[PDB]
């Protein structure tokens, strides 16, 4: 009985409305180009064209709910998990001080478009707080992304 | 949602502009 993998595809479904500020089913380089921003700055409306034109499996010029999954598999395939969580941790720590904050985890949040107390960022400190310093560290950040 | 899950989309982010 070989089973399949859409269990992990479910997930995905959840986030692409996060994506598409529109919840029209499609991403365009214009929406995206504001998370660009959130992450340093806005690439330019002819270089975002490049970018889908080489994952539009059907050249109509967005990244439609099966395309986008399509891409994520065949990224991280030809990267490592490594190299995404370095990126992803120097995004947090925005002041770069060697570790995040309770305020770094909620500008974050906010900015992607989800509404949470100050007590939800501090529970997301107490997952990865294994010393108790009340702060997630570069070594408990790691651990717990790479417990299993 | 668990914090996992949440950071392999952060991931995603760095990548998109990497190209
Ligand atoms: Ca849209
Ligand atoms: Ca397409
Ligand atoms: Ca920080
Ligand atoms: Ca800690």
Same mark, same amino acid.
């Given at each position: 009985?070989?089973?399949?993998?859409?269990?992990?595809?479910?997930? @995905?479904?959840?986030?692409?409305?996060?994506?598409?500020?529109?919840?029209?089913?499609?991403?365009?380089?214009?929406?995206?180009?504001?998370?660009?921003?959130?992450?340093?700055?806005?690439?330019?409306?002819?270089?975002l064209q490049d970018m889908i034109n080489?994952?539009?499996?059907?050249?109509?010029?967005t990244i439609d709910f099966p395309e986008?999954?399509?891409?994520?598999?065949?990224?991280?395939?030809?990267?490592?998990?490594?190299?995404?969580?370095?990126?992803?941790?120097?995004? @947090?720590?925005?002041?770069?001080?060697?570790?995040?904050?309770?305020?770094?985890?909620?500008?974050?949040?906010?900015?992607?478009?989800?509404?949470?107390?100050?007590?939800?960022?501090?529970?997301?400190?107490?997952?990865?707080?294994?010393?108790?310093?009340?702060?997630?560290?570069?070594?408990?950040?790691?651990?717990?992304?790479?417990?299993? | 949602?668990?914090?996992?899950?949440?950071? =392999?989309?952060?991931?995603?982010?760095?990548?998109?502009?990497? =190209?």
């Amino acid at each position: 009985a070989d089973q399949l993998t859409e269990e992990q595809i479910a997930e @995905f479904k959840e986030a692409f409305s996060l994506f598409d500020k529109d919840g029209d089913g499609t991403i365009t380089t214009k929406e995206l180009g504001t998370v660009m921003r959130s992450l340093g700055q806005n690439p330019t409306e002819a270089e975002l064209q490049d970018m889908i034109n080489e994952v539009d499996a059907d050249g109509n010029g967005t990244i439609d709910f099966p395309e986008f999954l399509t891409m994520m598999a065949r990224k991280m395939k030809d990267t490592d998990s490594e190299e995404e969580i370095r990126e992803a941790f120097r995004v @947090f720590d925005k002041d770069g001080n060697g570790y995040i904050s309770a305020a770094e985890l909620r500008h974050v949040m906010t900015n992607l478009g989800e509404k949470l107390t100050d007590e939800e960022v501090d529970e997301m400190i107490r997952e990865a707080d294994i010393d108790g310093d009340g702060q997630v560290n570069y070594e408990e950040f790691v651990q717990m992304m790479t417990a299993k | 949602g668990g914090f996992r899950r949440i950071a =392999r989309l952060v991931g995603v982010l760095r990548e998109w502009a990497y =190209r």
